[PDB]
Swiss-Prot record:
Induction conditions: By pentobarbital. Expression is negatively regulated by repressor bm3R1 at the transcriptional level.
Similarity-based family: In the N-terminal section; belongs to the cytochrome P450 family.
Effect noted on mutating F241E: Ineffective covalent modification of the heme macrocycle. Substantially slower FMN to heme electron transfer for the arachidonate-bound enzyme. Product distribution biased towards omega-3
Residues of the full protein shown: 4 to 456 of 1049
Region Cytochrome P450, annotated ranges: 1-435
Impact reported for A244Q: No effective fatty acid oxidation. No effect on electron transport from NADPH to FMN. Nearly wild-type level of high-spin conversion with laurate/dodecanoate, palmitoleate and arachidonate
Name of this protein: Bifunctional cytochrome P450/NADPH--P450 reductase
Lineage: Bacteria, Bacillati, Bacillota, Bacilli, Bacillales
């Protein structure tokens, strides 16, 4: 079978279609028009965009397809090197760092992060308790303050102190300008390097037994090779986790809140759970695990707007995809996750409705139908960290405040490496429950 291809532009082929600030949303509309698979060509390259669970289930076969570095990740690799997200599976440092860092996301490790997640969650609740009458909240801005502080503190024992600031941290500013200006740069790379230096120097100076992610980066040994990470790769991993560890979680929290204010019955059901479960001034680990409906809200927000919306794969060998599309070794595929998550054959006709109850019986979901954390051994290592943080925080938000969509906010999805509802604002009226 011959694959459909969207409109072309002479020798530029399909390239000009990506000349937009919202390329994923542009590719979603192309998928709506052309279906489960289309060819996308640019001078010198081809990729195939997949949107159905029928095809993505095969693409996720690790015997046949491995993670490819997208154009975006190739650029990110200029700063994150062979850290986990930007390494090829076949690079020695991928498996080495994978093995060393996996224990930093075990159940025991998650329980270890809980108190420091609460520290930051409490700073967010106090900020909003302290606003004057009629003041509003800039949602993605505050969520980014919380998620950046949480990975800094939990992962590295470093305080970004984002809630003490009006404009984001110089690390964040430098990380954007500096990569930006790769597709002053001197002073920016210096901001990044200095911070990495400091995170390392301070742990080394401290007379501190710690079992955090940094501790594993610095001291853990890979059981396979028996080697620890070398200093160059540790730096890459710190950069990798400071970024990967916060931007997509902030997106998720922002979309979740957006969907709750747009669906007041769902908000009321989630708020009732928060009030029933979170019976103490501080949530416990056990109580966060009992926020089942809040977890479903989060999953349903990842269904509609997965905040890392695409991942790339290459064919390990010549193979046939879906009984119909022959591929050659090296051929690239792109999984368009928001489109996968709208596959009517899986989810029913109401795919654009926000209905967390879709996730009541998750064993009913077919293989590879829901992929917001990627696939296989190259799946998100931080999935449980993101979900624990976002469950804790959204549960606290719903326990402490009523929310108003006071502007009747029109969804505007800004695309970076991640997705966010740009300009999303709300008002939060305190329920006056002490911390
Ligand atoms: C809701 C929030 C998050 C989402 C949706 C998400 C999504 C993803 C996706 C789709 C991938 C696969 C990328 C690819 O195949 O190219 C990935 C990998 C990765 N993520 Fe996450 N992520 C989230 C949060 C986090 C957090 C909190 C951390 C760190 C604490 C993190 C660290 C990583 C790392 C290191 C990888 C690379 C793993 C490897 O290839 O070995 N992510 N993530
Ligand atoms: C936030 C985890 C992650 C990793 C790679 C790309 C986008 C997101």
């Amino acid at each position: 079978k011959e694959m459909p291809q969207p409109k072309t532009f002479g020798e530029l082929k399909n390239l000009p279609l990506l000349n937009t600030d919202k390329p994923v949303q542009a590719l979603m509309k192309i998928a709506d028009e052309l279906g489960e698979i289309f060819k996308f060509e640019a001078p010198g390259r081809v990729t195939r965009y997949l949107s159905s669970q029928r095809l993505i289930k095969e693409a996720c076969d690790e015997s046949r397809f491995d993670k490819n570095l997208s154009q975006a990740l190739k650029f990110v690799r200029d700063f994150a090197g062979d850290g986990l997200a930007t390494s090829w599976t076949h690079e020695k440092n991928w498996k080495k760092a994978h093995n060393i860092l996996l224990p930093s996301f075990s159940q025991q490790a998650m329980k270890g992060y809980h108190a420091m997640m609460v520290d930051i969650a409490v700073q967010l609740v106090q900020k909003w308790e302290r606003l004057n009458a009629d003041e509003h909240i800039e949602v993605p801005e505050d969520m980014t303050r919380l998620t950046l502080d949480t990975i800094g503190l939990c992962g590295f024992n470093y305080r970004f102190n984002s809630f003490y600031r009006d404009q984001p941290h110089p690390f964040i500013t430098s990380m954007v300008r500096a990569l930006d200006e790769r597709m002053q740069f001197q002073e920016d790379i210096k901001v990044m390097n200095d911070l990495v230096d400091k995170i390392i120097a301070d742990r080394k100076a401290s007379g501190e037994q710690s079992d955090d992610l940094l501790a594993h980066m610095l001291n853990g040994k890979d059981p396979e090779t028996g080697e620890p990470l070398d200093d160059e790769n540790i730096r890459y991993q710190i950069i990798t986790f400071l970024i990967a560890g916060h931007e997509t979680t902030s997106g998720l929290l922002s979309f979740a809140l957006y969907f709750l204010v747009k669906n007041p019955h769902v908000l009321q059901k989630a708020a009732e759970e928060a009030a029933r479960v979170l019976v103490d001034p501080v949530p416990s680990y056990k109580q966060v695990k009992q926020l089942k409906y809040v977890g479903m809200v989060l999953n349903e927000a990842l269904r509609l707007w997965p905040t890392a919306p695409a991942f790339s794969l290459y064919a390990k060998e010549d193979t046939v995809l879906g009984g119909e599309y022959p591929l050659e070794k090296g051929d690239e595929l792109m999984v368009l996750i928001p489109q996968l998550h709208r596959d009517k054959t899986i989810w029913g006709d109401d795919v654009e409705e926000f209905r967390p109850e879709r996730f009541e019986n998750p064993s009913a979901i077919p293989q590879h139908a829901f992929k917001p954390f990627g696939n296989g051994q190259r799946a998100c290592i931080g999935q449980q960290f993101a979900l624990h943080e976002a469950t804790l925080v959204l549960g606290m938000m719903l326990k402490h405040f009523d929310f108003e969509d006071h502007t009747n906010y029109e969804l505007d999805i800004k695309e970076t490496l991640t997705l966010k509802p740009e300009g999303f604002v709300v008002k939060a009226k305190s329920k006056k429950i002490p911390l």
